[PDB]
């Protein structure tokens, strides 16, 4: 399901739900002391050692290897649908989900965010802090999280189509 | 401000806001492949090398060094106060903030969560993956994040007292 097109179709099926933006999950290499806000490199696919080595060769003073699961933003009509949606999200791995604002047209703006993630410093203060054996395990871990975090998005989309209140 | 007692007093001053639970931010060593849900060790203070070494000696197959900024749960009376509160949270470093549910008494249940964090594997598949120079930098980083993440909570509490709508 490239781009999660099938998942998004299911999520958009309900008349009271409309997705405005989505991210299927990604692996990024972020430069700087803080990774929570830029992006030296990003990919929505499992990352290779070569891709990581290319960024390490760029000589950033501080570099993070970060993987984040899917995150969705929706416009929902009514609290009854939003309620069922948030409960569904939390059951499928999106622990971090809630209403963030209310649009001028009164629709609820909801954010569905995956609980799966990893934010690991690869380089700190100009010093690479991960040896080769470690880097391979971290790369394998980032890829595992990326792939597995999408499963919950799929099951969630399955659940959403069934939400009667929506 | 031990325990953030002053911060909590300010946040609870408004008649339309009541905190039900809070965490001033913490550093934890979590066992297992997933760190997002247990806790091998936790501390709300900067961590020492000795504290970390004690857990490493326990021989966990998988171990994460995790630091999370402050997180608050509040019961808020009305969307006008909740709106001003969420906007205030986001301005002070709590990017992850929203209404998660609505209590039976109709008050809004809000979650304010810090954007600062780090989740780094220390041991994976029985193998310690961080050398000594690296561990010291990671420990220093975890402590920096813990301390700095509390600043936003303080400024936020300052802002909250001023929220007219609350």
Swiss-Prot record, chains A, B:
It catalyses: 4-demethyl-7-[(3S)-3-amino-3-carboxypropyl]wyosine(37) in tRNA(Phe) + S-adenosyl-L-methionine = 7-[(3S)-3-amino-3-carboxypropyl]wyosine(37) in tRNA(Phe) + S-adenosyl-L-homocysteine + H(+). InterPro entries: Taw3, tRNA_yW-synthesising, tRNA_yW-synthesising-like_sf. Pfam families: TYW3. Keywords: Methyltransferase, S-adenosyl-L-methionine, Transferase, tRNA processing. Belongs to the TYW3 family. It is an enzyme of class 2 (transferase). The keyword Transferase applies. It comes from the Archaea. HAMAP family: TYW3_archaea (MF_00266). GO terms for molecular function: tRNA methyltransferase activity. It comes from Aeropyrum pernix (strain ATCC 700893 / DSM 11879 / JCM 9820 / NBRC 100138 / K1). SUPFAM superfamilies: SSo0622-like (SSF111278). S-adenosyl-L-methionine-dependent methyltransferase that acts as a component of the wyosine derivatives biosynthesis pathway. GO terms for biological process: tRNA methylation; wybutosine biosynthetic process. This is tRNA(Phe) 7-((3-amino-3-carboxypropyl)-4-demethylwyosine(37)-N(4))-methyltransferase. Its EC number is 2.1.1.282. The keyword Methyltransferase applies.
């Amino acid at each position: 399901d490239p781009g999660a097109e099938k998942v998004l179709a299911r999520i958009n099926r309900p008349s009271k739900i409309v997705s405005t933006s989505s991210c299927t999950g990604r692996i990024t290499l972020i430069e700087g002391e803080a990774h929570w806000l830029r992006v030296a490199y990003k990919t929505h696919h499992p990352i290779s050692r070569s891709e990581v080595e290319r960024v390490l060769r760029r000589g950033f003073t501080n570099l993070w290897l970060k993987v984040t699961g899917p995150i969705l933003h929706l416009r929902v009509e009514g609290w009854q649908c939003a309620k069922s949606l948030l409960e569904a999200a939390r059951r499928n791995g999106f622990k971090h989900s809630g209403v963030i604002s209310i649009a001028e047209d009164s629709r609820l703006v909801i954010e569905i965010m995956s609980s799966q993630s990893m934010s690991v410093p690869l380089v700190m203060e100009g010093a690479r802090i991960v040896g080769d054996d470690a880097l391979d395990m971290l790369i394998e871990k980032a890829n595992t999280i990326l792939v597995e975090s999408r499963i919950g998005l799929d099951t969630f989309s399955r659940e959403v189509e069934e939400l009667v209140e929506c």
